[PDB]
Design a protein around this ligand. Structure first.
Ligand SMILES: Cc1cc2nc3c(=O)[nH]c(=O)nc-3n(C[C@H](O)[C@H](O)[C@H](O)COP(=O)(O)OP(=O)(O)OC[C@H]3O[C@@H](n4cnc5c(N)ncnc54)[C@H](O)[C@@H]3O)c2cc1C
Length: 244
């Protein structure tokens, strides 16, 4: 991996813990859904999904400060003009190309894991093959839904093809379902609220983020919907990308 020097052009502090960085670095083109590594000499490096469309040079990263973590608190300290090292070649297969044909593509993410979906929907290529697109972002509190405004513009842009839903687990917030993704699927509430069923006949489900959410959802979908982990060598219905 060859590292290049990037400059933070903008810092978006959504909450005390959530922030997005916009970086100009001479990186190579990537496929929406992919990730690169960011690093600081403390060289400590971590993977971060691109949030920007691959066609937009303002690289965007959505992060959360992990208090006891080594790199996140340092990136949280960066100010515009500061340098950060970035791997120029992207990696990752959490991309449309690896997604089978299906009538409804479900994109579920917890916390900062919504980034890859946003890159994909912002670029907006190769989506004609899906009749319905569903984007679900789950967080603890409503204040944590940093990209709700973007999701709303995207929904308008897609003229009904894309349905968006936010889920919050610790409060009641107008506009969101209260709960955890696995529970809402099981109770039929997610599908009822979104207006589309999630089954092996019509759907592919993309899961990204907290590994517990991913594992729980995958186990529930396997047991109750007979859905399976998708592999190149064994096509299925679920694609996952854990952030830890
Ligand atoms: C493919 C991939 C893409 C990722 N993309 C992003 C991204 O865009 N944004 C981002 O915020 N993180 C992302 N991560 C997570 C990331 O690389 C880091 O682990 C991170 O920011 C925390 O690093 P640290 O050095 O602060 O923590 P570490 O000292 O390395 O400690 C990590 C611990 O912090 C917790 N943790 C790790 N990541 C998170 C997270 N996203 N949310 C809540 N808790 C976390 C976990 O419990 C993990 O056990 C990604 C990881 C992978 C594998």
């Amino acid at each position: 991996a060859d590292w290049v020097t990037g400059k933070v052009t903008k810092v978006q502090n959504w909450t005390d813990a959530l922030f997005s960085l916009t970086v100009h670095a001479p990186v190579l083109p990537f496929t929406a859904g992919q990730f690169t590594k960011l690093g600081l000499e403390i060289r400590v490096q971590r993977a971060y999904s691109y949030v920007n469309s691959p066609d937009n040079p303002d690289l965007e990263f959505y992060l959360v400060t992990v208090p006891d973590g080594k790199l996140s608190p340092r990136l949280a300290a960066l100010k515009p003009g500061d340098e950060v090292q970035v791997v120029s070649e992207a990696a990752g297969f959490f991309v449309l190309d690896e997604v089978p044909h299906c009538e409804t593509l479900w994109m579920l993410a917890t916390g900062t894991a919504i980034g890859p979906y946003l890159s994909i929907l912002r670029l907006g290529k190769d989506l004609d093959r899906f009749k319905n697109l569903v984007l679900v972002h789950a967080a603890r509190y409503a204040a944590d839904l940093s990209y709700l405004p973007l999701m709303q513009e995207l929904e308008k842009r897609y003229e009904g093809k894309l349905r968006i839903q936010t889920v919050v687990s610790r409060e009641t917030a107008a506009g969101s379902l209260t709960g955890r993704i696995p529970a809402l699927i099981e109770s039929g509430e997610l599908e009822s609220t979104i207006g589309l069923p999630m089954n092996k006949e019509t759907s592919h489900v993309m899961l990204c983020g907290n590994p517990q959410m991913v594992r729980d959802t995958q186990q529930l979908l396997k047991e109750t919907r007979q859905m399976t982990k998708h592999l190149r060598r064994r096509p299925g219905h679920m694609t996952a990308e854990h952030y830890w």
